[model samples]
Target: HSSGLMYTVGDYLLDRLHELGIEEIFGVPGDYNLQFLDQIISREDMKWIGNANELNASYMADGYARTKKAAAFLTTFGVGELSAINGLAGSYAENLPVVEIVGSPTSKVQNDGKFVHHTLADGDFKHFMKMHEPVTAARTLLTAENATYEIDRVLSQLLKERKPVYINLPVDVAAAKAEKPALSLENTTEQVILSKIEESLKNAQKPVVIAGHEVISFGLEKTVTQFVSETKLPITTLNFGKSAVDESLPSFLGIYNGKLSEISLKNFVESADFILMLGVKLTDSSTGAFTHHLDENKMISLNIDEGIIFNKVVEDFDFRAVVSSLSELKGIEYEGQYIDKEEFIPSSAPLSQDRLWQAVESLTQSNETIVAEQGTSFFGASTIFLKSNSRFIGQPLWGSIGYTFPAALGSQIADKESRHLLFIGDGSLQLTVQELGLSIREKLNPICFIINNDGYTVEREIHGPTQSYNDIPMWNYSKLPETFGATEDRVVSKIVRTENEFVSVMKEAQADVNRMYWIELVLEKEDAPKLLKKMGKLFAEQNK
Candidate 1:
């Protein structure tokens, strides 16, 4: 009796997938990978989905991973890899486990010493494969035996690391003869020694726990909630990890952006005896590139790479563990540390940051969804938006400003009935505002809120003084959508300089579900929230 996912080249590939427990694959098929597409069609157990393009297919694969637990993407050679890289990178950054499979030029044509578009004519592979190493956990080797070994290896690592992986197949090699090996179940790796962590927790006088996107990406919500419950220690998040712990919890610090975090959080983080950096990379967005003095010695970072824990900072102790590990054993204690107690008043205008927050909170309807870009979007809409179980997708870990518009378009395609709102800053929106037309073409009707403050508010606040380049040339934000062939019928525009004007216009926009709306809020140059002022001063004084 013969066994495996595939018999001849086609069934061998298909049968191996069946053995690997793959039920479906998302991709855009081309002549390069048509055989595999046909194979999927023949197999009743395996489903193949066709997407608009390689980019959209990769993004769909990413979204599927959020629900399906583990997902894979299929695409053709170089063109596919470059376009699909963004979504794969996004998945890796946010700690998602996605496997990307691409069909390459025939093995006979490979780097045997010839120059190819994707490789050196001699069959040398593309440069991007190396470039992608930092972002992807594993890539399949070209040989059938080695490729199978690596594919199984990738599964083990993905489950252990919970990150994205990649596999490239030479077109001719897809049909190569091969024998299948028996698959085995992998035992979960136990987190680091909990007894030592508990001991350290007990000794610490003031300990605060900080979670990041990894916690949410790995589905460690209940574990995080439980950890905070057991320790009573106040929990804060790196921007990407918002809502990792319930925002409703008093102990949950809103978000800890240097420019957006409340004064209370800055002080709490700076003063804490122990700061558990749970699954956080401590990147610039999170730490302002060590510009925010977190007193390295007081930090205990939980991460996959243990070396990074003490890389820049003089760490007292660190551990390698999943975020869920902390919730398992308890020895920490906490007090009522209210992070939002600080009053947020804008300097030039009496408009309180609280008011702006409240406006966004109330402006959005229950059925609406929000896609907030980094920078101003992080602070401007953090407290203002009201989304009840609405999707709030962001590029926190990547901290890519222009990513929301295109990403939102992808997300809107997924859920059309849900009103999608893309909140981007003047600076960030300027980068990828062209995607607005995509929203119009698709008739997504997503309302885009342009929080215009005339400059890169987040950069100026964090980097100290607005550099000449940071101050962007003035563009009439309200007039932008009009230039894209948007009108009262398919699209509309509104400018709001006051609370009443903002609320009224937003309500009208929200009422019209058929068309897209672009609302520009002309805020004062000095109108940053007091929370920013306090955190800015603290970061400057303590670090400088």
Candidate 2:
């Protein structure tokens, strides 16, 4: 099957991925996908990021996709794909365009309805694709006839929807005769929403623009900002949309999270007559347990492909198209009135839940990428304003526990020039810590702050304050980097039990961008961020 090369279908798919600037493809190896992996590794131009687990591979793809605009991950049929589905669903909800390519049994076996190793023994290869239907933007089964066409179709949908797409390629279909291909956004009925939007702009006593994660996902941050600047309207961000817009702007209020927002921010947002919500995914977490309330008659929402204004939807509504077409007009002025406060005051303090956050805020840089887990780290970091060009990535919608570790590795691999800071708890770290070995192997210099709070502090605050299930196994966090294959020359591993020690270590930690910093900051088992406490209380109450 291999003499120089035979213009196989896998090559064509790889060619398309190459064109999309996906320099690295993340995945774990399995027998079914071995043929595809052979082609992937043969390409000297691309790097194959072999993950320890399929779920972690998917997460790395999600992280890499958000940074580079698109990413692809390979997994085998059945068990392997199932492992990665959780990560794909997260990307689907978070609006990251990721391609999930699965290598399955041969076209002959599938059509023959014969049981295979990775199959469920029911002689059905169609169930996996069906399972992915609810999570992915598009799904396709590749045959020799539709190889190139379906690749482009599914990938185009990935770009069009900014969500994960599933591609199933049988071994024979992957190696079948194929030709390489070339590559490649949208528009529409904005006149309806646009007319109402303009009318509301003039008649409204108060108007505000709320940016969401899609602003970043769709690459409309600057264009959205331009519209905000042209309109001179007050702007806010949702929890999912944090750092998507310039937060330092005077009219920029912090994230508006239903009742979780401060009284001033909540009242102000609740009273707005005109609410321009750009790419907002109003989820339970984003809306603070559905406490958020906005009148539909006063709302304008851009769903990336669809636009809604005053309950009137315009199908295929383009965010950039509509914003660029709007007439520049003056609006309400908000001068420096925002939920603002920040100061890096040095002190000989001890490490506590509160002080750890101070360390987090201080360590954050303007040009860095912040990856937070969906726990205390997320809640604590969510409240702070990110520096310019610094973006945040998390699975708040998916709420997966061990997401950010490998996700950070993916971001680091995507953009090695920028600082990648990962804030994760000990509980979360215990789940996906093996990827740190990849961090060492790839020679990436990401700083990981391991908050050693002893257990799942968020869980303890929720139902069982002293439940044994909430506790986690203790680990020698400082020794992990070395155990993961890092040497003392390029790795700085430290355990800081006091605030002064953490502050001092941080000063040295930032001294070099070429070295990896592994820090385990100690905190009490019961400790949690203020926001987390409130959220835990609410979540527990909802369960009842």
Measured with C-alpha atoms, the lDDT of residue 270 in candidate 2 is 88
Off by over 4 Å in 2: 1-6, 182-188, 202-205, 229-231, 323-342
All models: lDDT?
Answer: 0.65, 0.82
Worst 10 residues of 2 by lDDT: 329-338
lDDT of 1: 0.65
| Deviation in Å, model 1, residue 178 alpha carbon | 7.8
Candidate 2 Cα lDDT to native: 0.82
> Which window of 10 residues has the lowest lDDT sum in candidate 1?
307-316
Best by TM-score: 2
lDDT of 1 by residue, 457-489 (tens): 766766646578669887899998778777778
